[PDB]
Design a protein around this ligand. Structure first.
Ligand SMILES: CC(C)=CCC[C@@H](C)[C@H]1CC[C@H]2C3=C(CC[C@]12C)[C@@]1(C)CC[C@H](O)[C@@](C)(C(=O)O)[C@@H]1CC3
Lengths: 9, 244
């Protein structure tokens, strides 16, 4: 989620 | 080919150098920069939950640099979105512990923490001296191998690209990338005139790494079970997200 954001997903 | 392994190593090497918080040589230079007894006592006077929150902040900042490390590895970006997340969930803290060896004084058993080199006594209030001792043990062991930055980079990428994590979808593609990373690591280690027993020593460390991360996970989940509002309200979102 935040990880998804940071990865540019 | 040999050229392909050299390119792979260069990609991973540059990603690491770009995403390390501190220069290796700078960290090694200031091992004399240690917490004074008064500063140590200050940390020791913090209540367990407060000291943990401080530590989670530091861990999470380190993890943000690891996420960026991964993003700059071309092989990692080629993976599907699901697998990227799975790998980072399971592997980011492993990379943090490897990176710790860059900021560790193996002669004096100290680690660079909150601006100075800290003994295990700095972490007294966490109430888990056995876990802390294990962390310092891993640091001292790895730091005494005197790995180059490129060797650290490839070893970091190797543990991140573990094809045996649960819930992975492109197992075959990840296995291929990990095998190539390991061949590149072997090549670099040989080039730096390391004995052939160097790589098998590193492979053994992987088990230790997982055990370390295993302890951290079970500790955090126990903390969350008893103190759910503290975790939800006061711990970093990325930290909660990756580990709980
Ligand atoms: C119960 C808990 C959370 C225990 C953890 C406590 C201890 C072991 C833990 C809390 C904070 C954490 C930490 C590192 C690894 C372990 C350690 C010290 C290192 C040194 C790794 C390398 C990074 O480059 C660097 C320098 C950074 O982010 O600047 C950090 C600094 C902060």
């Amino acid at each position: 989620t935040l990880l998804q954001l940071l990865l540019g997903h | 080919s040999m050229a392909e392994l050299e390119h792979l190593a260069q990609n991973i090497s540059k990603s690491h150098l770009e995403t390390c918080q501190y220069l290796r040589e700078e960290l090694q230079q200031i091992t004399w920069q240690t917490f004074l007894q008064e500063e140590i006592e200050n940390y020791q006077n913090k209540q367990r939950e407060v000291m943990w929150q401080l530590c989670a902040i530091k861990i999470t900042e380190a993890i943000q640099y690891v996420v960026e490390f991964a993003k700059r590895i071309d092989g990692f970006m080629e993976l599907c979105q699901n697998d990227q997340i799975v790998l980072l969930k399971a592997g980011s803290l492993e990379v943090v512990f490897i990176r710790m060896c860059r900021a560790f004084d193996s002669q004096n058993n100290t680690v660079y923490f909150d601006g100075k080199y800290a003994s295990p006594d700095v972490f007294k209030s966490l109430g888990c001296e056995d876990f802390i001792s294990f962390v310092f043990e891993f640091g001292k062991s790895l730091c005494s191998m005197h790995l180059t930055e490129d060797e650290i980079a490839l070893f970091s990428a190797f543990v991140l690209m573990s094809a045996d994590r649960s819930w992975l979808q492109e197992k075959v593609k990840i296995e291929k990338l990990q095998q190539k990373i390991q061949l590149a690591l072997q090549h670099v280690l040989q080039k730096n005139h390391r004995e052939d027993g160097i790589l098998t020593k590193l492979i053994c460390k992987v088990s230790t790494l997982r055990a370390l991360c295993g302890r951290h996970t079970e500790k955090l989940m126990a903390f969350k079970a008893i103190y759910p509002d503290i975790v939800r309200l006061h711990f970093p979102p990325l930290y909660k997200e990756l580990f709980t």
